[PDB]
Amino acid sequence: EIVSEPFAKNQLREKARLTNIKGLEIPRVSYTLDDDDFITDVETAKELKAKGDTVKFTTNKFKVFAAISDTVIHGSDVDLVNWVENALQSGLAAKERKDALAVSPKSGLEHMSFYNGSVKEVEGADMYDAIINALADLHEDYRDNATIYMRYADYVKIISVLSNGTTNFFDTPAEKVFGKPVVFTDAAVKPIVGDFNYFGINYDGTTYDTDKDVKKGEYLFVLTAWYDQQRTLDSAFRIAKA
Amino acid sequence: LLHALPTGNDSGGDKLLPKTLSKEIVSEPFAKNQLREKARLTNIKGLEIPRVSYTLDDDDFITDVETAKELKAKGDTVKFTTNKFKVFAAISDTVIHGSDVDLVNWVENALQSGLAAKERKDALAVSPKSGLEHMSFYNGSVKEVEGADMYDAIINALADLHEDYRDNATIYMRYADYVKIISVLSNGTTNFFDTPAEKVFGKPVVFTDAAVKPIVGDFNYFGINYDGTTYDTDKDVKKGEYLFVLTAWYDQQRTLDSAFRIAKA
Amino acid sequence: PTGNDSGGDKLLPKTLSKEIVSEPFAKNQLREKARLTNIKGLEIPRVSYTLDDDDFITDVETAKELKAKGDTVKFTTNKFKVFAAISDTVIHGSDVDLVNWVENALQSGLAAKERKDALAVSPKSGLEHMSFYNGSVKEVEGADMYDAIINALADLHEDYRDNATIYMRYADYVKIISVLSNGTTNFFDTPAEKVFGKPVVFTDAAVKPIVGDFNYFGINYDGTTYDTDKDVKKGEYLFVLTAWYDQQRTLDSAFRIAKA
Amino acid sequence: LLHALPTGNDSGGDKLLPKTLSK
């Protein structure tokens, strides 16, 4: 009987939080120390003042589909059970990663993306300089917990300049070059970096349905849900650029 | 093409979602002190540990080291002295009544994280402040050595140290500096990035971003303690905020300052 | 912190519903006087009775319409559809509109369908015979609205007069007062029964005041059917209802118009 | 999107009509 792989996945689910709570509200600033605090970084003064202390997780709709013609049903195969779950679950993942890493987001969902704007682009001479400088920019608390996302091909080019003749960092991991964990993803254009503790997602509710289009002779299996994902603090996550 | 009325609002699609969903907020500590591993911790009140040990009635009145004698002339004992602390949490009003969640970890992760950030900051402070000068390694009490490059410096740092203290020595430095040391050594030879850091210098290493200059020495002498804590809640009515606040008392001092050094180029 | 439980609910008012409710969105004023029926097929005679030999000739009108239409009257089915649409988010936000919001909605749809057709200035084709302004009613002419209504009563037959009723828009009932201002006296406080001498009902659609014996006018609803379905893709439930009715005038000569 | 055959012709919408009907 039939089986297959996850057709698509979201790499960002590794580090980000994931929730199922109906309405969700958290504070942005975890703690403040005693009187002898050097002034909080100019950034956090601005965004905290503008956004407010809390953060709103606000429902947003979409729809996922699935279509099976009638002949396929009546040829002794069982795709009703597994082919759809393999299909719909993947649809949830691609919807996320498309919106977060959108170069030019659709309207009504700008605030989710990391490339919509409102993040500072540092400038390194090459990719190796830009990533290390970007770590040099953000606040140190975020640095200690930071994580990098990038495309694997860019990790090859930094090796060609760190070829150094005899030595070959094709065998080395990527943790030890930059000094922090790395995850590889093809959509991420400009290497982004920050503490992905703060980034978070929430799924509130769903509903599963099925129906037959009698004339055209195709079953349907549809699902819907509402989610949203926001950055607790924009000042954390930063860009690298040549 | 059915006639039923979904009044119940029970959702069948819930199981299709990823099974890693939390239903309760959780996160890791925001900050941590990386000195706690090597150094000594204590809860007792009013601590005093003598500097002296190992007297011989020697006719060869040379002690161990010239630096060791002249700075014991400072004093016989060390006495840790109390210093004040303050920690604030600030969960607001909407979050409490807006929805049913649980924040006890969010508070806990915030408070005892704040302690570690305090004691690391002052102990590694570049420019100390009033009353706090007597714990920072970058205070002028401790020496600088001078290698031509930072590699030979750390060697010349671990070199001019007591035989004993060398044995359980330990190094602190930034990782970014640690890379430049190796990109130059890897020229025309084996790779070192696959190697542990214990071996290029011979002894264990820990990495933190604070140490603008390296440290070397045995941190069994560096010591910390906490006298006792105070915890109480509070509500500001006019604004709506709930306040969770902590205060305790502490000090940290090094037993002997000759056991530690600074490398520099 | 235990939760958002508090004692403010006592301070909160007592008029709070805890679930949704609303008014009839629209109504048909004509249902007060007209007959209303549920019979499958309905047939009645037009002329109630005739007296003995000494009957002055029946009014020229009734001779004509009775001769043309015939003795009986046919109630003939005519279709329409009423709709209702609820998006999916509205369902899944803990509210109960399934039970009351629809009945409040559909029942109103029946009423507006009636009054639209009866008082239609220019009816849709296939349903001309229902309206009162399609034609076939005589328009008397008064110098003002007060003269036109009273003259219109002077026109129709007296049996219908004794049982007659007037429908009009309230604003026209104000203008007749301004001419009957008479200085000191003010008929804003008076009812309208006593000015014209017969009952009155107020309605905004009725343009030219109509008048006659609304015993004769009648309505019938034969059958219905209630259905529901989901448009899966667009994610909206539906609640639809249908029925067949018709309403006719037993005798056209009764109901008359007033005009300036 | 149901499979049933309404043979009975019993009408559920009857009660929605006004309750002042005469018969």
Author numbering:
A (entry chain C): 152 to 393
B (entry chain B): 129 to 393
C (entry chain C): 134 to 393
D (entry chain B): 129 to 151
Structure paper excerpt:
An icosahedral reconstruction of the procapsids from 28,566 particle images reached a resolution of 4.0 Å (FSC = 0.143). 3D classification of the data without the application of symmetry (C1) indicated that only ≈1% of the shells had portals incorporated, and no further attempts to reconstruct in C1 or C5 were therefore made. These procapsids show the expected T = 4 organization with hexamer/pentamer clustering, and at this resolution secondary structure elements and many side chains were clearly visible, sufficient to model with confidence the proteins that make up the capsid. Cycles of manual model building and real-space refinement demonstrated conclusively that the pentamers (subunit A) were made of Ccm while the hexamers (subunits B–D) were composed of CP. One striking difference is the exceptionally long, extended N-arm in CP, especially in subunit B, where the chain could be traced all the way from the δ domain cleavage site at residue 129. The Ccm N-arm is rotated by ≈80° relative to CP around a pivot centered on CP residue L163, and folds behind the P-domain where it points towards the interior of the shell. Other major differences include the E-loops; unusually, both proteins have an α-helix within their E-loops, but the location of the helix is on opposite sides of the E-loop hairpin in the two proteins. In contrast, intercapsomeric interactions are sparse and mostly mediated through the P-domains, which interact around the icosahedral threefold axes (formed by three C subunits) and the quasi-threefold axes formed by A, B, and D subunits between two hexamers and a pentamer. At the icosahedral threefold axis, the N-arms from three B subunits come together to form a triskelion-like structure. Our results suggest a model for size redirection in which preferential incorporation of Ccm pentamers prevents the cylindrical midsection from forming by imposing a constant curvature on the capsid shell assembly.
Staphylococcus aureus pathogenicity islands (SaPIs) are molecular parasites that hijack helper phages for their transfer. SaPIbov5, the prototypical member of a family of cos type SaPIs, redirects the assembly of ϕ12 helper capsids from prolate to isometric. This size and shape shift is dependent on the SaPIbov5-encoded protein Ccm, a homolog of the ϕ12 capsid protein (CP). All tailed bacteriophages (order Caudovirales) package their genomes into preformed procapsids made from capsid protein (CP), with a ring-like portal protein (PP) forming a unique vertex at one end of the capsid.
